[PDB]
């Protein structure tokens, strides 16, 4: 089972390993990281707006 | 006709390592780095000294005969087009107290250049890194020019 | 407060009528000594903030 061994696979929703012979460079629309950042910032503003709700 | 293979094709290689229409063969490995100690290259040509080059500023330096893409065009027709790569690499070491350290180290590497790179007048292995130490001398192919490497306190 | 502001108006006008109390010798001593220090600290004097400024 020749498995990817190179430096750093970027994270995904499912966090799955890149293939045996992954050419080993990131080609991606970046939509992954966009969704990740927006995912965290939603929680951020949730907290920030709660703090107002109690005021 | 041609049967479908599972073999490669320069497409990704070409676009990813291409520049100016002249694809470079070498890539900077992750430990590319820039040094604190400021390295200087003292050129000579048969006892005639040439002005020093200050090469502490980039992580990679291309030496060859093609003035377009090379950092340093070494104008001896016995020099191939894309010839050698000077490179700073952050290479780990052991501090005398055992704690692990790394220093930016200057390493030269040849791309299978035609006629050979001479380290202290030894021809070196191509596609392989060789460290450069204080005062050391360099000669590429059979050029009439030679170089000595120093830094500030050296 | 009214008592205070009366004291102040007094103290300003008194300063004007009685001249700077920090004579001239003291002024020159202070000034020169500051300059000695700064220069001995190679302090580059801050410059008026350029318009197309980075920050």
């Amino acid at each position: 089972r020749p498995r990817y061994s190179g430096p750093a696979p970027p994270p995904n929703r499912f966090n799955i390993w890149p293939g045996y012979r992954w050419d080993g460079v990131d080609r991606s629309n970046g939509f992954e990281q966009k969704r990740f950042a927006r995912l965290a910032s939603k929680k951020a503003v949730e907290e920030l707006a709660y703090k107002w709700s109690v005021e | 006709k041609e049967k479908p293979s599972f073999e490669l094709s320069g497409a990704l290689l070409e676009d990813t390592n291409t520049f100016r229409g002249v694809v470079i063969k070498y890539s900077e490995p992750p430990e590319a780095r820039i040094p604190k100690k400021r390295w200087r290259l003292y050129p000579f040509k048969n006892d005639e000294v040439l002005p020093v080059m200050y090469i502490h500023r980039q992580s990679a330096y291309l030496l060859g005969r093609h003035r377009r893409i090379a950092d340093i065009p070494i104008d001896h027709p016995s020099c191939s087009k894309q010839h050698a790569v000077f490179q700073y690499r952050l290479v780990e070491y052991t501090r005398a107290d055992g704690t692990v350290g790394r220093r930016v180290k200057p390493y030269i590497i040849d791309l299978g250049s035609g006629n050979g790179t001479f380290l202290n007048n030894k021809r070196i292995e191509p596609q392989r890194y060789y460290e450069l130490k204080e005062k050391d001398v360099l000669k590429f192919g059979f050029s009439s020019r030679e170089y000595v490497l120093l830094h500030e306190s050296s | 407060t009214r008592l205070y502001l009366k004291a102040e108006q007094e103290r300003q006008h008194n300063y004007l009528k009685d001249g700077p109390y920090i004579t001239a010798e003291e002024a020159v001593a202070v000034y020169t000594t500051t300059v000695h220090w700064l220069e001995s600290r190679r302090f580059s004097p801050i410059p008026f903030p350029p318009l197309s400024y980075k920050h």
């Binding site: - | - | 700077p20 109390y21 920090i22 002024a27 202070v30 000034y31 500051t34 300059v35 700064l38 004097p45 801050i46 410059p47 008026f48």
Partner: protein, 55 residues
């Protein structure tokens, strides 16, 4: 923050050289005060010269 400052100050006093020795008749002295009127006594023109040294 100020309380960390207090801690810093204590242990600074501690790490002096031979600070607690009293054998040969040494004496430590800690003195602390105010400047008792700095604002109200800053003198405008001289302050102008002292700023011209900086900006």
């Amino acid at each position: 923050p100020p309380p960390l400052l207090v801690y810093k100050w204590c242990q600074g006093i501690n790490n002096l050289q031979d600070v607690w020795e009293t054998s040969e008749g040494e004496c430590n002295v800690m003195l602390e005060s105010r400047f008792e009127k700095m604002y109200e006594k800053i003198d405008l023109t001289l302050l102008n010269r002292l700023l011209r040294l900086i900006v």
